């Protein structure tokens, strides 16, 4: 034994009374020695949110040359408005409804475990860090071109198979007949059309992929919707196997879109 006794340390949390104390002294005594690890694991997962968004851009810049996928500008200064619209909406999505807070958390801790194909180290990280799982999805689903901007139709019917699901996917955007703040164009006097003028540039040049870039993306999107929505729905797999733009425009998150 160490000494004459072994009392507990005064640096241990939850050591004082907190029974009939004032509000200032109640809150000082419940957060006694817990402030350090809350801020340790706050810069932890933010660095994880900064790290996997780097590891998927390495595919976007293969061997030190930029592809046609980056293309943040088309006319003189065509990234300054894209600079504002990407960072002003990131605050708009941080003042969301309190129902969509954990709806974002528990669904990010659903799809990532599926996409991390049975690697026990990786699912242990996704449960403790909600910022990592929000960055694991949108990094990988943009590394493999699967969301909206690159899965262009090739037939004539697939433009309505896209249009059938998406306006039915925007049941998630409008709660009722009102709109939401999560789906907002912009908030400046030109920013509405300034979101459109880039939206046609990003669809057009992304239809100019190589023959390898389209034939490898038309099967990666198929198995993507085959393990995110149609887990056993073989009718939905009967359109997901041969028509991949159906299997790609439907988004795995409750994105409120």
């Amino acid at each position: 034994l160490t000494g004459y006794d072994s009392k507990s340390s005064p640096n241990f949390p939850n050591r004082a009374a907190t029974r009939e104390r004032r509000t200032v002294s109640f809150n000082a005594r419940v957060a006694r020695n817990k402030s350090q690890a809350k801020k340790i694991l706050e810069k932890a997962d933010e660095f994880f949110a900064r790290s996997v968004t780097m590891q998927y851009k390495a595919f976007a810049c293969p061997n030190g040359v930029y592809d046609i996928q980056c293309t943040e500008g088309t006319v003189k200064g065509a990234a300054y408005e894209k600079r504002a619209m990407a960072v002003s909406a990131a605050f708009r999505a941080k003042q969301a409804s309190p129902a969509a807070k954990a709806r974002a958390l528990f669904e990010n801790r659903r799809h990532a475990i599926i996409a991390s194909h049975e690697c026990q180290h990786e699912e242990d990280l996704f449960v403790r860090f909600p910022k990592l799982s929000a960055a694991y999805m949108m990094g990988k689903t943009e590394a493999m071109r699967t969301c909206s901007r690159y899965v262009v139709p090739d037939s004539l019917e697939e433009e309505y198979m896209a249009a059938s699901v998406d306006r039915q996917m925007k049941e998630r955007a409008c709660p009722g007949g009102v709109y939401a703040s999560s789906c907002v164009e912009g908030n400046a006097k030109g920013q509405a059309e300034q979101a459109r003028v880039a939206a046609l540039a990003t669809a057009f040049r992304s239809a100019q992929k190589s023959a390898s870039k389209t034939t490898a993306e038309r099967y990666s999107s198929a198995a993507y919707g085959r393990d995110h929505f149609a887990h056993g729905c073989s009718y939905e797999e009967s359109v997901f196997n041969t028509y991949p733009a159906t299997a790609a425009a439907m988004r795995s998150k409750s994105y409120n879109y």
Binding site: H117, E118, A223, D227, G232, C233, S234, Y235
Partner: protein
């Protein structure tokens, strides 16, 4: 449609690999049940035209408010088509005993059933009566064996837990 061994190969390409050594351990287990369950499919097979009309008028013995007009159960050929609606629920519950899993159940008995029974106002409590009317009389040492007697009802109450 998800059965015992089409599921574990739906997850075997979901990682992009071959079958493992435990992938074959799963396929041994339905072989342990491809005798105790196929007798339960045969008991439904050579008795289905006795149980369509047995549990069919069972639900009509419950609900007297269908027997007066104001419902879709006024005339005879509706009740004839009601006995058709019995036959579909016995056609695919016979199928799942052949493949082992809940494959044919979730497709055309479970999913989509909400719309054409609630906008069409044919109540799901009226269906679960005749579903349980098959379930509340399993004569376990008489009609089948002891292991077929417990898993035949385990497929019977699947539409119970889903639709009601």
């Amino acid at each position: 449609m998800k059965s015992v061994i089409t599921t574990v190969v739906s997850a075997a390409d979901a990682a992009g690999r071959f079958p493992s050594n435990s992938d074959l351990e799963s396929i041994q287990g339905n072989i342990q049940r491809s005798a105790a369950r196929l007798e339960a499919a045969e008991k439904l097979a050579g008795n289905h035209e006795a149980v369509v009309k047995e549990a069919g008028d069972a639900c009509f013995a419950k609900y007297a408010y269908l027997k007066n007009p104001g419902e879709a159960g006024e005339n005879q050929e509706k009740i004839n088509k009601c006995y058709r609606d019995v036959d579909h629920y016995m056609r695919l519950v016979n199928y799942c005993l052949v493949v082992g899993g809940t494959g044919p159940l979730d497709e055309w008995g479970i999913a989509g059933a909400r719309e054409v029974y609630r906008t069409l106002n044919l109540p799901t409590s009226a269906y679960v009566a005749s579903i349980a009317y098959t379930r509340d009389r399993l004569c376990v040492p008489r009609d089948m064996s002891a292991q077929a007697g417990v898993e035949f009802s385990a497929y019977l109450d699947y539409l119970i837990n889903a639709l009601s």
